Amino acid sequence: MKKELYEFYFMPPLKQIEFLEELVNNPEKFKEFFKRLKEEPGAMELFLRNLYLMHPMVQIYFLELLVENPELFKLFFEYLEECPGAMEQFLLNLYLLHPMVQIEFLKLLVENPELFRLFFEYLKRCPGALELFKEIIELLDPIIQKYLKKLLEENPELKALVKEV
Amino acid sequence: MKKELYEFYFMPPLKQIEFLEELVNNPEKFKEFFKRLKEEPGAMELFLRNLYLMHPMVQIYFLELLVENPELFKLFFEYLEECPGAMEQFLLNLYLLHPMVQIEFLKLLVENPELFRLFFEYLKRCPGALELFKEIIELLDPIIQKYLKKLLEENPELKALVKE
Amino acid sequence: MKKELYEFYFMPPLKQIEFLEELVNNPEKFKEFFKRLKEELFLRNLYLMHPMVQIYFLELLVENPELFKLFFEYLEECAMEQFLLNLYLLHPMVQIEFLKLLVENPELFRLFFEYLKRCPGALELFKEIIELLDPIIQKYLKKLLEENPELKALVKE
Amino acid sequence: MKKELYEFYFMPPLKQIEFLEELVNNPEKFKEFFKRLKEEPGAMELFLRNLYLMHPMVQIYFLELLVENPELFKLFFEYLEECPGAMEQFLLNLYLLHPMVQIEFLKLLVENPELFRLFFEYLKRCPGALELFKEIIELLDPIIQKYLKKLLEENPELKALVKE
């Protein structure tokens, strides 16, 4: 994926929405596109950057599809986990996300504790970045910290999974 | 319902305003739209979040149309009360709304005080909700507070009804 | 009148600039059409428009000086508080340029203060806006006040 | 030229990228683009503001083009060196840049440390500027400062280059 990443970024949002749906609806091309970005040096950082510089609803739609297909949230995170720098960009974007996009990613993680448990597990799997996701959550707008605290308090083990160390 | 709402979001804002004006000017389509959202899982919250992520002027014009047609502002917020978590979603948007949109929304509410009281009445009906709004009042830039002060000093009873 | 202001907003930005450019170039269009508004929503729509549209509309007032007076003439007639508030809520680049245009055209700067000095307004209102600012903007504002040593004394007065 | 600069801004964002991609390759147009801006009084400040208000990808891709062609990253900065304030406008933009664009600019400097030192040598040349960039970096978002420190662990040399 040397090029296309910019071309696909400048594809119309309705085509980006449709492309991401077909990519998620069938694991075909899903594995290819993320493997091409995985094998290419740093191209996984660009995709996340492109994905997280895209229109906000394109990012929300991808998160909703990853929840609807939990197996692909595994494969999407499995590629992000191995390649270097891809885990840091995902975290960096979390703070730089629009708070409505933040609350939707936090709402989907709470409703999917298995994906939430997968999300935190991969954070421990990546060298470091434990402090990063910590500081990103601590250094955030207060109502997000309030809302996240209330959602985690509904399931204390999910709260205990946030407490960690 | 995803096709109904998500396409409505991605459609051009001027076409959305055309639909919003058609939905408002016809009160029964307004009733139908929000009654259709109640049975569907979180369709109100989805439609709200879509409305919250839309263009600011569309949100503003939607607020104006609800002011010019008062009964629908009642229906919109009474449907919000019926839908669990909708008022929580609305107050969260007000905190995350662009400060200019917050001022226009506040000015329209103070100008039509019955809509301002009806705004609070449904917030208290929900499990919690009202407590969130009081914390949202704290976290805002000063020009919101100062411009709130100019209007609310001319009618301190509204500022009184806020603390009540 | 609502459609005119909303249609002018939702038009493509390049056409909005071309709409304002000839409207400002022809003095009758800037003088009479703005008088039809007299017969806040336009300011908000302008200040919710694309930054380039806001930048060029402010620059067009510099390119044609007499119409910047008229622009502030009608606003001062009835609205001033809305213009002062929109300044604080303006995008930082839009704000810097507006203050930079006043220093580039000092007669518009004095005219900006003069219309604000009408009634005991902006004596404290425009005072707060300067103090409630991020530091890096103030540095550029202060360094630009050095060019034109004359303007330094007028701001303190 | 003011029509030409505004035509470049309001050109479609994909068009702006294709124009900048070609302009970098051939120096003849590249030198013409900044020579015609420098012969005008203060037009370099205008084009910068235009570039600094363009789409984030347009701003990012222009920096990447200068990174892919390191000699022209010196030239584009050499042309800004001629007039004062354009450096300050470049620094003012860096603070006012979207946080992902500030990271992208710093990340390109980390991936090409020689261009980092190239850009940093220019800052000490302008009056202040090095003092202003000192203020900018210490007044950024915390995670932007945090991730910068992690980039200092990847390149501790840059810490010594900063001390100068």
Author numbering:
A (entry chain D): 2 to 166
B (entry chain A), D (entry chain C): 2 to 165
C (entry chain B): 2 to 40, 46 to 84, 87 to 165
Provide passages from the article that reported this PDB entry:
Here we describe a systematic approach to generating modular and rigid repeat protein oligomers with coincident C2 to C8 and superhelical symmetry axes that can be readily extended by repeat propagation. Repeat proteins are composed of an asymmetric structural motif that is concatenated several times in tandem within a single protein chain. From these building blocks, we demonstrate that a wide range of unbounded fibres can be systematically designed by introducing hydrophilic surface patches that force staggering of the monomers; the geometry of such fibres can be precisely tuned by varying the number of repeat units in the monomer and the placement of the hydrophilic patches. All multiplexes follow the naming convention CsHRN_Rr where s is the cyclic symmetry, HR stands for helical repeat, R is the number of repeats in a single chain and N is an index to differentiate between multiplexes of the same symmetry.
